[PDB]
Design a protein around this nucleic acid. Structure first.
Ligand SMILES: [Mg+2]
Ligand SMILES: [Mg+2]
Ligand SMILES: [Mg+2]
Ligand SMILES: [Mg+2]
Ligand SMILES: [Mg+2]
Ligand SMILES: [Mg+2]
Ligand SMILES: [Mg+2]
Ligand SMILES: [Mg+2]
Ligand SMILES: [Mg+2]
Ligand SMILES: [Mg+2]
Ligand SMILES: [Mg+2]
Ligand SMILES: [Mg+2]
Ligand SMILES: [Mg+2]
Ligand SMILES: [Mg+2]
Ligand SMILES: [Mg+2]
Ligand SMILES: [Mg+2]
Ligand SMILES: [Mg+2]
Ligand SMILES: [Mg+2]
Ligand SMILES: [Mg+2]
Ligand SMILES: [Mg+2]
Ligand SMILES: [Mg+2]
Ligand SMILES: [Mg+2]
Ligand SMILES: [Mg+2]
Ligand SMILES: [Mg+2]
Ligand SMILES: [Mg+2]
Ligand SMILES: [Mg+2]
Ligand SMILES: [Mg+2]
Ligand SMILES: [Mg+2]
Ligand SMILES: [Mg+2]
Ligand SMILES: [Mg+2]
Ligand SMILES: [Mg+2]
Ligand SMILES: [Mg+2]
Ligand SMILES: [Mg+2]
Ligand SMILES: [Mg+2]
Ligand SMILES: [Mg+2]
Ligand SMILES: [Mg+2]
Ligand SMILES: [Mg+2]
Ligand SMILES: [Mg+2]
Ligand SMILES: [Mg+2]
Lengths: 319, 349, 102
RNA sequence: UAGGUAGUAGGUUUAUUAAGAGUUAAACCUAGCCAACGAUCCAUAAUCGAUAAUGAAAGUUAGAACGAUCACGUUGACUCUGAAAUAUAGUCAAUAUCUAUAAGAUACAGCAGUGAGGAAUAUUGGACAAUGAUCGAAAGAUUGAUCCAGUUACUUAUUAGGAUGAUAUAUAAAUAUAUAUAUAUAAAUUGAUUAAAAAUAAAAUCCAUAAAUAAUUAAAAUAAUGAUAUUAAUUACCAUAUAUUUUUAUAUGGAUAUAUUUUAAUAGUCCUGACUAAUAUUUGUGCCAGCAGUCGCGGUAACACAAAGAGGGCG
RNA sequence: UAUAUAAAUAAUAAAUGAAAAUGAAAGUAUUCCACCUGAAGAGUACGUUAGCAAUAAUGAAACUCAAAACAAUAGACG
RNA sequence: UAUAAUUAUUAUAUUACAGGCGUUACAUUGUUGUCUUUAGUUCGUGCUGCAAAGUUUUAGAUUAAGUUCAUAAACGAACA
């Protein structure tokens, strides 16, 4: 049974009834007015608890289920307010116990209907500075920094690169007071990342799932026969999982055991340059049958899957 | 793309990638997605409505279907056995709309550079973004792991800041502000005792919520109880006489001249600058303040690292699905994405 | 009734059970495959806790017969690994589970 | 289409070719050869891919477009050159048109274009600037190959504005920083009297960009040569000196009286009984007018015809 | 005239089945042959073959439709 | 009620219908005749069949009677 249903709030609200013919209002509009509260001369809905932004490092996300739609609170006393018969506002007759105690997971969950989404932790400026120094000044490996602080190798590389950008923007004295206000405001909006705490730390034993390990296999062997992860690797013809974890640990730019000297054995000739020439030629050896444009290739220009790419300057080029 | 036609309608109640107040209320009252008493086609249809409303509103459905990739991405943890406890099920199908997260528009929106994906599109198309130092005008640009992108700081402040009031709006606000300030001072001068005691009562209950506590303490200690003590927040009558009434605002002569009207305003909390337009050259509410209703939407993504000091971000990787957590940010539960995924697998058959 | 599930996600192996005039061909699925089956079976699975499956219905497609057949197939057509190992005197190992183990 | 074949199946010699071969010509023999797993005959069709469509796949379809192969250049036969032509050559035969009336010339399946046929498919365009091809010792000459532009929504892609936004008035003694500002007046479009809306939709406000005009103006091409071309792109003052992912700032000379051009945004089309997403109701006709892919709707309850409001897809 | 082995018949278990039911099969399997792909047109028209003949064998397409058909259930009717 | 005011009626008009034993028991309400003093008609939970359904409501008897017993997937209940 499917029917068009106007998205009336699930929580109860006062519904307009006998009204002057020259009002032309709707139950949805009055629901919003009840939820927002009065709009002052400045255009600010001070009553609504979500108008402001938290400064206590605890996110203030919507909890419609727990507060039964009562989104109005005193700006200073931070106590619930609800509409009465007289049309004024004041303390509720009873206290809502669900709002009293909220699990930390719910605190970090922004959307009520999706319990699989959580907001990451903002790293403190001190931690970023320490990571920068240890990578650069102390000349350590990003693997070590990841292991101590629990962050990922891409994250620590991003930390160092962003800190370098911040330093460059700083020695030019370009960052204005507005950006500092922005950072201060947003810094207190999300929880800080405590390397000491285990449950904030991010797991570093994460491996992409190969397509073959997602396919179920079963072997019937002597019960006594011991079967281990290495035998599984042999039968699945994949590198052992621990070995794959070790391999990805060395792919970081600052991680130990990294080398990208594979493509240093191709004959490349740079043509001579004379005065007045606006260009120079590079000649790279390429074996016949492996170089050139195919004859009779596919023409996807007029099809939905046409290839579209970008050049160095960023212009959209039909690759 | 598709033109914005009733994006934030209340009757439909769709939730969009926006900070708009109407969108926030729709998210607030949505109360989940109804899927009972619906034939499987109807459930699939409702899921596609809601998901497409949030993810990829501006993309045409034919483009989305071409972009849509059946194969999803997930990560497996080897240390699961080390913990030796019950493991949370991996939300595999929350990564249905994960292909769109490589796009520069979604990347900007998640990084809190634009209030909406549409605003991110306009920022990109107007030449305010640069990927790895190369200015990119095309919103559909796809990002790679380890990439950098930056936005012009003024644009970000405009997106996350309050709207700049026009001249006459600011003048009206100033006039009423002076009106109310005159009331405050007159009531303070007429009966200083009750005004001071209620001021102290408000001072007592503050619950570490506003910064005026230290201002008031500095105010008292500046001239009251320099060395004496009581066995302090004591009453003084001097401040009542020290308060001076502010001149009124004509609102009919001061119009049409900002520098002229700005010399008359001398409010204690606003000196020599009309409300909002402290520096009209900037496009945002000066002094800068967070825009209204920013808390419910402020989310820190895991696949990006952001430095608001310089409006630079790094694309760490594509969103992944770890046990008990999915990196794709969405207000829809896993079943909704399941229905949407099995709608688009067969092109809606 | 009680339905045995492989890793609380999918059935064990493939099922080709016949209910009166309904030929139920069901085959297991990869993690994150989804319920790519007929709507009657999809509802039965979603209520029973099965998340990944794939199959096709042949001959009669009566809804009620399909529902009865699939419930029966889950109940008796399939067999758990432990029961096979015990009655066989052999050891059956899940390569996927032992590849990602400690 | 149930029998077909008579150089037909085979053997021996001679003749042409570089060559074997009843491939062709000549002589003598043997009596064979194909055929119900489909001969002979008839009709139809250009064939294929690492090409296009579709499907989970085996497959199925097309043979437009890119490429490969075959055949033809109004129709049929023959001949010289050569290694190769039954040549878009020539001869001859056949057909149609034209003027020069002749063993005359042409045949738009080369480009552009015209008439007809059809539901339907374009300019009687620019340059040899680039890549090739031909002639020439070279200078260079030609190139409807080719490169470009024009018609066409035939196809694909990008763009085709973001944030804010439910009223306007009047009142408010005459700088320790307050704040839940509070009262009266008027108006309020379509449907309705509350879960019945249209509707943040509109207006209005803030901030941008396109387009225009100014400067630079690469690259396709170098020794020089640019059809495309009023080129793309960048700056919204030009350039030198400094720090420096890019970006930007510092500050100098060139023109002004403490600035440095202007500036917006009007989508169509189909459907709302079920299969099938679309509940906000109302009017007209009354087995008529009509709708319909299937079930079917209309004879006074039409959610189905024709419409208004509202809504749902694709764009 | 008690005991064992073969065959037929009749009633069944399991199995199969849309069920009625089959039950050395209409069950579990293997091999070979014939035939079917909606109704009506139609085993009709035309051709061919064979017969003294009546005819037998082979055997289409066009027009129309969302029908057509079997087992079993509950009534009504005789 | 204190010559006036109010009210109720009557008469004359007109928009306006009223009125009809006119048709339709084949549009109906109500009622009635015959099967009929006939013994039938159904529901809840349980069970059987994939299901429509079935059971109960019956082998066999008895009674004026699905009345009462006997066995029985049935155990009860409602109008008769
Ligand atoms: Mg519907
Ligand atoms: Mg069905
Ligand atoms: Mg010979
Ligand atoms: Mg011959
Ligand atoms: Mg001869
Ligand atoms: Mg043949
Ligand atoms: Mg042909
Ligand atoms: Mg083919
Ligand atoms: Mg073909
Ligand atoms: Mg071709
Ligand atoms: Mg030829
Ligand atoms: Mg011709
Ligand atoms: Mg010829
Ligand atoms: Mg000729
Ligand atoms: Mg032509
Ligand atoms: Mg055309
Ligand atoms: Mg040339
Ligand atoms: Mg398009
Ligand atoms: Mg009205
Ligand atoms: Mg421009
Ligand atoms: Mg129509
Ligand atoms: Mg009507
Ligand atoms: Mg219709
Ligand atoms: Mg209609
Ligand atoms: Mg309309
Ligand atoms: Mg529309
Ligand atoms: Mg049996
Ligand atoms: Mg069988
Ligand atoms: Mg049969
Ligand atoms: Mg016959
Ligand atoms: Mg019909
Ligand atoms: Mg029958
Ligand atoms: Mg009867
Ligand atoms: Mg009458
Ligand atoms: Mg009469
Ligand atoms: Mg009667
Ligand atoms: Mg009657
Ligand atoms: Mg049953
Ligand atoms: Mg009876």
């Amino acid at each position: 049974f499917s029917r068009r249903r106007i998205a009336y709030p699930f929580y109860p609200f006062k519904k307009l009834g006998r009204q002057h013919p020259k009002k032309h209002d709707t139950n949805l509009k009055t629901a919003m007015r009840q939820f927002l509260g009065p709009k002052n001369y400045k255009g600010e809905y001070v009553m609504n608890k979500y108008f402001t932004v938290p400064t206590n490092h605890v996110p203030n996300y919507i909890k419609p289920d727990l507060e039964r739609g009562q989104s109005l609170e005193h700006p200073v006393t931070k106590k619930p307010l609800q509409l009465r018969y007289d049309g004024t506002l004041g303390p509720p007759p009873v206290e809502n116990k669900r709002l009293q105690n909220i699990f930390k997971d719910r605190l970090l969950q922004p959307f009520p209907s999706n319990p699989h989404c959580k907001t990451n932790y903002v790293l403190s400026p001190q931690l970023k500075q320490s990571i920068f120094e240890e990578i650069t000044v102390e000349g350590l490996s990003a693997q070590q920094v990841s292991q101590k602080y629990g962050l990922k190798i891409p994250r620590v590389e991003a930390i160092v690169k962003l800190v370098s950008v911040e330093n460059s923007w700083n020695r030019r004295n370009r960052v204005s007071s507005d950006l500092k206000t922005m950072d201060e405001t947003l810094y207190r909006m999300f929880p800080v990342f405590d390397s000491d705490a285990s449950f904030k730390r991010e797991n570093l034993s994460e491996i992409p799932v190969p397509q073959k390990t997602l396919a179920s296999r079963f072997l019937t062997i002597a019960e006594s026969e011991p079967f281990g992860p290495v035998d599984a690797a042999h039968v699945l013809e994949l590198e052992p999982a621990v070995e794959t974890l070790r391999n990805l640990s060395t792919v970081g730019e600052h991680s130990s055991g990294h080398q990208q000297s594979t493509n240093k054995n191709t004959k490349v000739i740079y043509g001579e340059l004379v005065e007045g020439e606006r260009s120079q030629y590079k000649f790279t050896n390429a074996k016949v049958g492996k170089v050139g444009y195919r004859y009779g290739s596919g023409n996807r220009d007029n099809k939905k899957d046409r290839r579209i790419g970008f050049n160095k300057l960023g212009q959209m080029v039909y690759i | 793309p598709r033109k914005a036609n009733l994006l934030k309608s209340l009757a439909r109640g769709r939730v969009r990638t926006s900070f708009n107040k109407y969108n926030l209320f729709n998210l607030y009252k949505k109360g989940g997605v109804d899927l009972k008493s619906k034939s499987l086609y109807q459930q699939k249809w409702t899921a596609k409505q809601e998901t497409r409303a949030y993810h990829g509103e501006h993309l045409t459905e034919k483009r989305w279907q071409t972009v849509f990739k059946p194969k999803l991405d997930s990560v497996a943890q080897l240390d699961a056995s080390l913990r030796g406890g019950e493991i949370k099920e991996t939300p595999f199908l929350l990564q249905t709309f994960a292909v769109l997260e490589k796009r520069l528009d979604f990347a900007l929106f998640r990084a809190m550079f634009a209030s909406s994906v549409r605003q991110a599109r306009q920022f990109i198309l107007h030449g305010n973004v640069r990927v790895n130092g190369v200015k990119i005008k095309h919103p559909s640009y796809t990002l790679k792991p380890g990439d950098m992108f930056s936005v012009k700081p003024d644009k970000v402040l405009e997106a996350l800041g309050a709207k700049k009031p026009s001249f006459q709006e600011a003048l009206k606000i100033d006039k009423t502000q002076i009106v109310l300030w005159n009331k405050y001072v007159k009531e303070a001068k007429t009966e200083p005792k009750e005004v001071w005691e209620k001021k102290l009562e408000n001072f007592e209950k503050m619950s570490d919520s506003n910064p005026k506590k230290l201002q008031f303490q500095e105010f008292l200690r500046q001239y009251n109880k320099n060395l004496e003590s009581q066995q302090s927040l004591t009453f003084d009558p001097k401040w009542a006489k020290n308060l001076k009434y502010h001149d009124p605002i004509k609102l009919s002569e001061l119009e049409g001249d900002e520098p002229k009207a700005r010399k008359l305003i001398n409010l204690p909390w606003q000196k020599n600058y009309v409300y909002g337009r402290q520096d009209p050259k900037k496009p945002f509410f000066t002094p800068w303040k967070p825009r209204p209703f920013l808390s419910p939407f402020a989310i820190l993504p895991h696949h990006l690292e952001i430095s608001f000091k310089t409006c630079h971000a790094v694309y760490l990787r594509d969103p992944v699905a770890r046990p008990g957590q999915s990196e794709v940010i969405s207000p829809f539960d896993v079943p909704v994405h399941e229905r949407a995924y099995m709608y688009y697998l067969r092109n809606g058959k | 009734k009680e339905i045995p599930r492989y890793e609380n996600r999918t059935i064990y192996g493939d099922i080709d059970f016949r209910y009166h005039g309904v030929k139920l061909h069901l085959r297991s699925a990869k993690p994150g495959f989804g319920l790519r089956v007929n709507h009657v079976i999809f509802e039965i699975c979603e209520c029973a806790g099965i998340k990944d499956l794939s199959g096709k219905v042949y001959k009669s497609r009566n809804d009620m017969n399909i529902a009865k057949g699939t419930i029966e197939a889950f109940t008796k057509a399939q067999k758990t690994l432990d029961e096979v190992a015990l009655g066989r005197g052999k050891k059956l190992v899940d390569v996927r589970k032992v590849y990602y183990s400690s």
